[PDB]
Amino acid sequence: CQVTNPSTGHLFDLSSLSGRAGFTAAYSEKGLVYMSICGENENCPPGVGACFGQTRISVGKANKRLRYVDQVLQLVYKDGSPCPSKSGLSYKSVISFVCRPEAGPTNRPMLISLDKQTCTLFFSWHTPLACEQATECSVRNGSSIVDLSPLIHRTGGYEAYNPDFYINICQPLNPMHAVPCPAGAAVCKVPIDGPPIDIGRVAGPPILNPIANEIYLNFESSTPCLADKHFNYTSLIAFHCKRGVSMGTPKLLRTSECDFVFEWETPVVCP
Numbered sequence: 683c684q685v686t687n688p689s690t691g692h693l694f695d696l697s698s699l700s701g702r703a704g705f706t707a708a709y710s711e712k713g714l715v716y717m718s719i720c721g722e723n724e725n726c727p728p729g730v731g732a733c734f735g736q737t738r739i740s741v742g743k744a745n746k747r748l749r750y751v752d753q754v755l756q757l758v759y760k761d762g763s764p765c766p767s768k769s770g771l772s773y774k775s776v777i778s779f780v781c782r783p784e785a786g787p788t789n790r791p792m793l794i795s796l797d798k799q800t801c802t803l804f805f806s807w808h809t810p811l812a813c814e815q816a817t818e819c820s821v822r823n824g825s826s827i828v829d830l831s832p833l834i835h836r837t838g839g840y841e842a843y844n845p846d847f848y849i850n851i852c853q854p855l856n857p858m859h860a861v862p863c864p865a866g867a868a869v870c871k872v873p874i875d876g877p878p879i880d881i882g883r884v885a886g887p888p889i890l891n892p893i894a895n896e897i898y899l900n901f902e903s904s905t906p907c908l909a910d911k912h913f914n915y916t917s918l919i920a921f922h923c924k925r926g927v928s929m930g931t932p933k934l935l936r937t938s939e940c941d942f943v944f945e946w947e948t949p950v951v952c953p
């Protein structure tokens with residue numbers, strides 16, 4: 683139950699979570715999905731690695747094929763009960779292990795979405811077990827050192843105050859009430875009756891420009907742009923010092939075909 687990052691030669695190990703005893707993911711105040719990570723769950727039919735409901739409805743047969751896909755580790759449990767939507771179909775689960783450097787109170791899988799017509803359940807597990815480098819969230823500005831970490835949203839995300847935009851810095855977006863933003867995404871566009879788009883992932887440490895007196899954070903998505911298939915969707919945050927009784931929320935500046943630029947007026951970049 684382990685996989686490697688083919689780029690930096692970094693081994694990830696999830697066998698820490700393995701076993702028939704397994705874990706639960708909540709779909710209500712008391713209603714749970716039962717799952718194990720590599721190998722079946724004791725609370726399910728044989729083979730079945732994730733199931734739920736009074737009658738153990740299978741949402742995938744267990745496998746240990748743990749895949750690495752863009753700073754997100756992933757299992758796809760396959761072949762559950764039939765589908766009412768598209769006839770010859772089966773319920774399946776996509777378990778997406780997302781990096782959360784912190785301890786974090788939750789530490790369990792969570793149901794982000796169900797693709798009804800293709801019967802896909804999407805779970806996410808925000809875990810330190812899916813991290814490589816630590817949160818690069820600070821930069822040096824002369825004698826001082828500006829920490830943007832106070833702006834890292836730790837339990838959810840930020841708005842953008844009509845296509846919605848949700849954004850988080852230094853870390854992926856956390857799962858949030860009925861907003862199925864893709865797993866791993868730091869910057870997420872949400873259109874109406876189009877699926878949520880990843881328009882940027884954590885790209886590195888905040889970069890400082892001392893002439894224009896601005897701090898930049900850059901974001902790059904894995905998903906290819908619409909107009910040109912050879913560029914990725916991109917994101918930029920311009921940080922501006924602004925004395926205030928509260929830290930600002932990132933307003934959007936302007937957009938091109940593939941690029942997105944955001945300003946953030948926070949009393950956090952102030953000397």
Ligand SMILES: *[C@@H]1O[C@H](CO)[C@@H](O)[C@H](O)[C@H]1NC(C)=O
Pocket residue numbers: 823824826891892895896897923951952953
């Ligand atoms: C960095 O420190 C200097 C001196 O205090 C200040 O003028 C500047 O606004 C600070 N931040 C940036 C973004 O350069």
Ligand SMILES: *[C@@H]1O[C@H](CO)[C@@H](O)[C@H](O)[C@H]1NC(C)=O
Pocket residue numbers: 752903904905912913914
């Ligand atoms: C765009 O994203 C893909 C997948 O993450 C990556 O392989 C590629 O290098 C990025 N940029 C380009 C050159 O399209």
